[PDB]
Write a protein that binds this DNA or RNA. Structure first.
Ligand SMILES: Nc1nc2c(ncn2[C@@H]2O[C@H](COP(=O)(O)OP(=O)(O)OP(=O)(O)O)[C@@H](O)[C@H]2O)c(=O)[nH]1
Ligand SMILES: Nc1ncnc2c1ncn2[C@@H]1O[C@H](COP(=O)(O)OP(=O)(O)OP(=O)(O)O)C[C@H]1O
Ligand SMILES: [Mg+2]
Ligand SMILES: [Zn+2]
Ligand SMILES: [Zn+2]
Lengths: 199, 50, 343, 49, 148, 348, 65, 197, 103
RNA sequence: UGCUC
């Protein structure tokens, strides 16, 4: 009886998959035949074949879903900061405090190459910088680390160690990733959407 | 099997083959092994240059 | 202590209940601090030895002590593949009416070993299908099955009704070429077993064919493999952590091979001891008894390999081992000559 | 249903558009009673390796 | 001398979570001179240990006592007077994390150095004054010698 | 003049599986001629094609135009399509016999001598890797015995040579991570890599598989380009098999047999469940049974019986997992996530 | 169809021990003791001789003759 | 007369259909203490997801049978139990679980884990690579629509179905799609009048 | 044309060398690996197979100091040849004395 | 129709 019930379940699954194959095949055919006309133009506006605009900007922001590092987000600031700290450790430079970190961030972000970047990404960068600066402040207040750089135990500076070089590297890497993660004009976005919804 | 679906949207082409696959981890991910028998049939037109 | 553990790791291979440990060769310079494992020809020649324990026709068993697993495996693989022998390669068929397929018949004939000495022949050059007197041998096989003129009325058994209905390999006749008849005496060139059943015929059917055999190595095709089973195993050495006596001694005797553990009455009570760890095959049946797990310690000697070579009968196994070592030396000499020519 | 093996004792005289035969077919070692009932051991379609 | 730290520890537990690994064990040890706790992965197959064992442990920047920090490459075949001659169990690792203690919400003075000897984890936790000289991305030598 | 040359090495060739669900079902690869009669490719690319090497026939097309060749190589390049456009997750990653191999390699029990370590490192020095230095990493334990851990051997794949600018960094959780160790888990399931050196954790499907983000190959692709990730994947595919074969990994009937305590627990659980089911049946048939909200009494009994059976199932599975000893091939393959899971083990 | 000459796994000559094996079946010997007397220690040759079916005579019964 | 090669499909009487991936020499195959080398090496990763314990039971029963010269029965809802075959294995001096001590043939060193050896009844299927291998040159075309034929027996070429066109569109390779569906398949040059169309 | 040498890069560094050997297999590769690994002047020694289809192997040798990594190769070859000669002589003597004592 | 996947 147990073997018969197991065979029943197996055949049920088999027929389910058999119906699913054809059903999803038809659905994919329809979705692709309907969405094969859209394309990303050079002015960041998704337009149909007749010239009508479907979206003034793809996804509201204009980022490539294939180049999405985070969960529906362009970058994971924590991972990028850790990678920058690990790849470029500067032992000959002192650590930065909250005020110094905020000052260098505001001075670097106001450059020309950062003007063309979207405002939301800059606001997210500012929020992450403020968060890490508050964390550094809390750490230094817990361990009484002085911003002057004359504390006797230097190992205390290794808890949250940040140098302006690492800050600049992090900002440049984030900007480059955000610029290279945008929708490249000419891509058949409609067909990609149809396939990603059909599969 | 109509003309739109059978002869315009999807149609048969030449210079193509169909064969069974087998594993081979000694090749790169961007590389594929082709048998000598099929390689001698599928030809590529190269233009004589300097 | 730590020294005992290091010694057990570098000398013994322990087999656990779930997995084997200390399986990698580590006796190399730089791996051990208190040991100078640098290569020394004197120590190798001193510690190395070979002792033959059994040697009969087409069967040899010998223990090599001092050699490493690498050279042991090299010798094994050379014997398996890189030892050349003679085997049927080309088959010329003349009106084969047998039910057995021509290709299947040629394949079966290719697997039949030949007693010819391969050292007296040479490899056939590329092509040259005609073959020369130096690098080929010819075997004619002509069998015509017919009804027995004198047989019983019923004669239900095929033996009485028909004659030559089973084409054994003894019907193969070696046809000398050139001066092979003078060099090889009569009876030397012949099938090894002389009893291999090639095919079965019926009256009216006839098998007439010629077989050209040339020299070849086992790597090209398995039909040239001289050794039927050439393998080696590490010498077991069973040790008892604590003296086991009583009916547990009989349990031990029943767990391992019947010929490795022996029970003796030294003071009227049965006590078990290792008699001959050679016969043990490490069935790992002692792990079933819960109490007798922590009383034994199965291990294999790293520098003691028992080689067992059972051949197909082309030539004795000692000459096979000699030719394997000679082929390895020839490869080494060829590579040395190539290197010298490079520089 | 697509296994390769012998068809019958008259497979040599039989001439079909497509036939597959095995050189050295061997009967299974773990054979079910149904195999003995259908006499499949007499016409095996595989080898024990 | 490149000795960054040196202290005698006593083991208080061998496997608090059970016998996970056959060759490696997670020893927990406490120091006598200071309140330095050590959670160290040790290879018991080659260097066996017990519960009541007391051993001297030294974390140094270089393996040579003369102060030569030329550690570009290590040649096991080279024989020369080194610090390892005075110890029994020598490992080579890198101090890959320095984390401040989070249990004390305020007025915290305890830190912890996590070192990875080829995967073997070693957390040395205690007062920051004893961890002087420890820096991230710094390769060091651990030397353990059992005492009577 | 035009010469119809044979298909030689270096020619871009389209390779596709007839049933296509997404665009990654067809990719442009580089053709290499081989004497056999089958299409062979790296198994790490099986997930996009969804192939299983069980008799599937795949199609191979040869473009007849230089422009088409260049477009196929650039847009449909295997190195340029390591991620799907659906959610950006990497599809071209490790697969069975590569996740288990890397897992067993990076286990804390692995300790290799100089000979075995050098052999495993040379196992990948083929092709373009023949013009680079080995860079043998220093040994971990050197005084008692010079032993190279398997994690260093695995990291050598990330940074084989000195001049290689690959500096991989990752910090994530494994499948069997407890949730409190924070890089000190008793199971050592917290993956931590710094400067292309495996500092902590064991590799599994969560880090080498094609499941989701946080994959080492994904980080390499997003940090150092496509070529570095492709080279790392090739090195892994060339190293893991050699070590897995030299070590030995097999499954037998003894790896799935139940223990005495397991049988006792199963018997007790079955007795308890049958007793509770009989009690519920008696309560419903004779008397008033507590009716669950949003359903009738019969559906309430159905739900209660299903709950009791699921309790029996999960308790038997937990008992079997607790009684099973380490080094068990099914348990290892379920832990590393290569193939199977705990449910299949409990069922079988 | 017919007993193979060589064993698949090892390669020991087993074709010459077929008819003799049949003789052991004509005698009172069982399968195990017969295979043991023939000198087949490893189980590969035991499987080769035991799992083999003799179909050559059944085909010869259909041969032209 | 065809010999098994790379691409030939093989079954093991348990639905574990597989294709020959590689043919390694005999010297490369691992060997046990008795010197037996395996003919077929299968992937164990197929057991957990498929739970084919029946294959392991069949292998153990076959090993016991070939050791004691018997034919065990795998009858459904019955047959020889595991205990009987384990007793038969331990009586003949072999392991009671099939796993045996094996030495690596390549490196010559013993394996850390025991290998599960035993006789399994493998059956070869009619699906061969030689019959399925296909390659199409220019070749002939159909009269109605000048395109390659369909079947291999008819010397037909492969079909770039609608899904292949969808994938090529998603990739954006316009020139590749044009060369496939226009240049290399049904290219032609017609004459159109610019006045009447 | 059987055994060919290759430098680690275009700089022609004699410290790291690669010997590509033709018509060989794991036998001689492993034998020479074991015989040359015992040379104290060898940092890294490793043999590999390019592809099972073609019959060729690639050995790689990196020494400690300024050794050309070619002299260790000849050293290992000569040591292997000497070991082969010694084991051959020992086996011949063993077989001879066994035949003598058997009769 | 049978199949293969
Ligand atoms: N043997 C065989 N039977 C077929 C074939 N095509 C169809 N049939 C059988 O005929 C029935 C369906 O007929 P169709 O396939 O519709 O025939 P059709 O396509 O209208 O015929 P044509 O237009 O001449 O191709 C099925 O029940 C099949 O068993 C074929 O190619 N071979
Ligand atoms: N009708 C079909 N349409 C599309 N693809 C198919 C069809 N039939 C088979 N395939 C191909 O075969 C694959 C189906 O295998 P899958 O269902 O995943 O395993 P399976 O056949 O259930 O094997 P198990 O029974 O799990 O051992 C996926 C698909 O590419
Ligand atoms: Mg499939
Ligand atoms: Zn055999
Ligand atoms: Zn007109």
């Amino acid at each position: 009886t147990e073997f018969f019930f197991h065979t029943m379940a197996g055949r049920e699954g088999l027929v389910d998959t058999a119906v699913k194959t054809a059903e999803t095949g038809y659905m994919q055919r329809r979705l692709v035949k309907s969405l094969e006309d859209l394309c990303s133009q050079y002015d960041l506006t998704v337009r149909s074949s007749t010239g009508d605009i479907i979206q003034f900007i793809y996804g509201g922001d204009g980022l490539d879903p294939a180049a999405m590092e985070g969960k529906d987000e362009p970058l994971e600031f924590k991972r990028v900061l850790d990678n920058i700290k690990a790849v470029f450790p500067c032992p000959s430079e002192p650590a930065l405090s909250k005020n110094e970190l905020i000052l260098t961030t505001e001075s670097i972000m106001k450059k020309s190459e950062f003007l063309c970047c979207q405002d939301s990404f800059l606001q997210e960068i500012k929020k992450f910088i403020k968060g890490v600066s508050e964390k550094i402040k809390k750490t230094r207040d817990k361990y009484g680390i002085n911003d002057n750089g004359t504390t006797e135990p230097r190992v205390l500076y290794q808890l949250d160690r940040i140098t302006p070089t690492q800050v600049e590297k992090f900002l440049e890497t984030c900007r480059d990733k955000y610029m290279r993660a945008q929708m490249e004009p000419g891509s058949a976005v409609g067909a990609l959407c149809a396939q990603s919804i059909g599969e | 099997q109509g003309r739109f679906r059978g002869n315009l949207s999807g149609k048969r082409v030449d210079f193509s083959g169909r064969t069974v696959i087998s594993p081979d981890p000694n090749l790169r991910i961007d590389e594929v092994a082709v048998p000598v028998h099929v390689a001698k049939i599928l030809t590529f037109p190269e233009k004589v240059n300097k | 202590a730590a020294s005992q553990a290091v010694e057990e790791m570098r000398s013994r291979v322990v087999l656990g209940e779930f997995g084997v440990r200390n399986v990698h060769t580590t006796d190399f310079p730089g791996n051990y601090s208190g040991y100078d494992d640098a290569w020394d020809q004197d120590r190798f020649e001193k510690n190395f030895r070979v002792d033959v324990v059994h040697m009969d026709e087409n069967s040899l068993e010998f223990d090599m002590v001092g050699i490493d697993a690498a050279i042991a495996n090299a010798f094994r693989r050379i014997l398996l593949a890189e030892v050349p022998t003679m085997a049927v390669e080309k088959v010329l068929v003349y009106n084969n009416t047998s039910i057995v397929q021509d290709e299947i018949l040629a394949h079966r004939l290719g697997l039949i070993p030949i007693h010819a000495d391969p050292r007296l022949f040479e490899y056939r050059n590329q092509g040259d299908e005609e073959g020369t007197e130096i690098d080929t041998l010819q075997f004619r096989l002509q069998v015509r099955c017919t009804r027995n003129p004198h047989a019983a009325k019923d004669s239900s058994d095929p033996n009485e009704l028909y004659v030559n209905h089973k084409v054994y390999t003894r019907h193969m006749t070696w046809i000398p070429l050139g001066n092979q008849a003078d060099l090889f005496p009569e009876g030397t060139i012949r099938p090894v077993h002389d009893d291999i059943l090639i095919a079965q015929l019926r009256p009216g059917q006839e098998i007439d064919l010629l077989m050209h055999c040339v020299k070849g190595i086992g790597k090209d095709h398995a039909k040239f493999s001289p050794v039927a089973t050439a393998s080696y195993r590490l010498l077991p050495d069973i040790t008892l952590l604590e003296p086991v006596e009583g009916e547990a001694a009989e349990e031990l005797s029943r767990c391992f091979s019947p010929g490795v553990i022996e029970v003796q009455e030294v003071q009227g009570k049965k006590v078990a001891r290792v008699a001959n760890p050679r016969l043990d095959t490490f069935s790992r049946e002692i792990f079933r008894n819960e109490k007798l797990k922590k009383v034994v310690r199965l291990a294999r000697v790293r520098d003691h390999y028992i080689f067992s070579v059972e051949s197909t009968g082309v030539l004795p196994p000692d000459v096979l081992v000699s030719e394997a070592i000679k082929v390895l030396m020839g490869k080494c000499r060829r590579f040395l000559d190539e290197l010298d020519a490079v520089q | 249903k697509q296994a390769m093996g012998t068809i019958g004792y008259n497979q040599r005289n039989r001439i079909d558009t497509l036939m597959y035969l095995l050189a050295y077919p061997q009967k299974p070692m773990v054979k079910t009673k149904t195999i003995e009932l259908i006499e499949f051991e007499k016409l095996p379609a595989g080898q024990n390796a | 001398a490149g000795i960054l730290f040196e202290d005698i520890f006593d083991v208080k537990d061998i496997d608090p979570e059970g016998k996970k690994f056959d060759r490696v064990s997670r020893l927990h040890c406490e120091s006598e001179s200071f309140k330095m706790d050590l959670i160290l992965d040790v290879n018991i197959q080659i260097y066996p240990v017990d519960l009541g064992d007391k051993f001297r442990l030294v974390i140094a920047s270089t393996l040579y006592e003369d102060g030569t920090l030329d550690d570009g490459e290590y040649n096991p075949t080279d024989d020369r007077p080194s610090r390892a001659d005075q110890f029994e169990y020598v490992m080579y690792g890198k101090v890959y994390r320095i984390e401040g203690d989070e249990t004390s919400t305020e007025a915290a003075t305890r830190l912890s150095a996590y070192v990875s000897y080829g995967g073997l984890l070693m957390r040395l936790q205690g007062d920051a004054n004893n961890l002087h000289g420890f820096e991230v991305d710094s390769r060091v030598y651990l030397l353990m010698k059992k005492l009577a | 003049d035009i010469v119809e040359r044979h298909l030689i090495d270096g020619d871009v060739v389209l390779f596709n599986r007839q049933p296509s669900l997404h665009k990654l079902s067809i990719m442009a690869h580089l053709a290499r001629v081989k004497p056999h009669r089958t299409f062979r490719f790296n198994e790490c690319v099986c997930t996009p094609y969804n192939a299983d090497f069980d008799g599937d026939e795949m199609n191979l097309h040869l473009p007849q135009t230089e422009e088409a060749k260049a477009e196929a190589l650039v847009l449909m390049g295997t190195k340029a399509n390591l991620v799907t456009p659906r959610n950006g997750e990497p599809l071209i990653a490790a697969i069975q016999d590569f996740l288990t191999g890397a897992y067993l390699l990076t286990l804390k029990d692995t300790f290799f001598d100089r000979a075995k370590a050098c052999q495993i490192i040379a196992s990948i020095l083929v092709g373009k890797d023949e013009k680079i230095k080995v860079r043998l990493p220093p040994p971990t334990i050197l005084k008692p015995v010079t032993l190279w851990t398997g994690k260093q051997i695995f990291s050598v794949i990330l940074r084989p040579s000195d001049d290689n600018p690959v500096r991989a960094n990752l910090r994530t959780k494994g499948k069997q991570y407890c949730g409190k160790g924070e890089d000190l888990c008793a199971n050592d399931s917290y993956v931590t890599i710094q400067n292309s050196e495996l500092m902590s954790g064991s590799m599994d499907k969560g880090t080498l598989g094609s499941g989701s983000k946080n994959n080492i190959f994904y980080i390499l692709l997003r940090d150092w380009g496509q070529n570095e990730a492709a080279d790392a994947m090739s090195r892994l595919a060339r190293l893991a098999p050699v070590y897995l074969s030299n070590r030995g990994f097999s499954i037998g009937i003894g790896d799935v047999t139940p223990g005495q305590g397991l049988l006792k627990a199963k018997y007790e659980l079955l007795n308890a469940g049958y007793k509770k089911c009989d009690e519920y049946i008696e309560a419903l048939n004779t008397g008033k049974l507590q009716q669950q909200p949003g359903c009738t009494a019969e559906e309430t009994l159905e739900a209660l019986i299903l709950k009791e059976l699921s309790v029996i199932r999960d308790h038997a599975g937990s008992a079997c997992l607790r009684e099973l000893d380490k080094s068990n091939s099914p348990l290892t393959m379920a832990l590393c996530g290569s193939k199977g899971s705990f449910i299949n083990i409990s069922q079988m | 169809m017919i007993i193979p000459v060589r064993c698949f796994t090892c390669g020991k000559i087993v074709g010459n021990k077929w008819e003799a094996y049949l003789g052991l079946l004509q005698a009172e010997y069982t399968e195990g003791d017969a295979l043991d007397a023939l000198g087949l220690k490893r189980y590969c040759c035991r499987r080769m001789l035991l799992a083999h079916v003799d179909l050559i005579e059944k085909l010869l019964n259909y041969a032209p003759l | 007369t065809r010999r098994p090669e790379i691409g030939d499909k093989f079954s093991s009487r348990h639905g574990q259909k597989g294709v020959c991936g590689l043919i390694v020499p005999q010297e490369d195959m691992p060997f046990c203490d008795s010197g037996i080398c395996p003919d077929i090496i299968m992937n164990p990763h197929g057991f957990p997801s498929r739970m084919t314990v029946g294959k392991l039971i069949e292998l153990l029963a076959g090993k016991a049978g070939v050791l004691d010269g018997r034919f065990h029965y795998g009858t459904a809802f019955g047959g020889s139990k595991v205990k009987d075959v384990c007793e038969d294995l331990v009586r003949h001096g072999y392991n009671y679980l099939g796993k045996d001590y094996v030495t690596s043939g390549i490196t010559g060193e013993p394996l850390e884990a025991y290998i599960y050896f035993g006789p399994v009844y493998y059956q070869k299927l009619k699906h061969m690579v030689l019959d399925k291998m296909h390659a199409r040159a220019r070749g002939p075309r159909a009269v109605l629509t000048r395109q390659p034929t369909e079947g291999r027996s008819r010397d037909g070429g492969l079909r770039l179905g609608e899904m292949e066109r969808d994938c090529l569109i998603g990739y954006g390779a316009s020139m590749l799609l044009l060369e496939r569906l226009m240049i290399s398949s049904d290219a032609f040059e017609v004459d159109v009048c610019g006045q009447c169309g | 044309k059987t055994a060919l040498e290759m430098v680690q890069a275009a700089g022609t560094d004699r410290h790291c060398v690669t010997f590509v050997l033709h018509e060989e297999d794991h036998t001689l590769g492993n034998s020479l690996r074991y015989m040359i690994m015992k040379n104290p002047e060898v940092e890294f020694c490793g043999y590999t197979t390019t592809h099972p289809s073609e019959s060729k192997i690639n050995l790689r040798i990196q020494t400690r100091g300024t050794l050309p990594a070619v002299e260790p190769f000849q050293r290992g070859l000569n040591e292997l040849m000497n070991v082969c000669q010694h084991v051959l002589d020992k086996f011949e003597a063993s077989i001879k004395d066994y035949k003598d004592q058997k009769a």
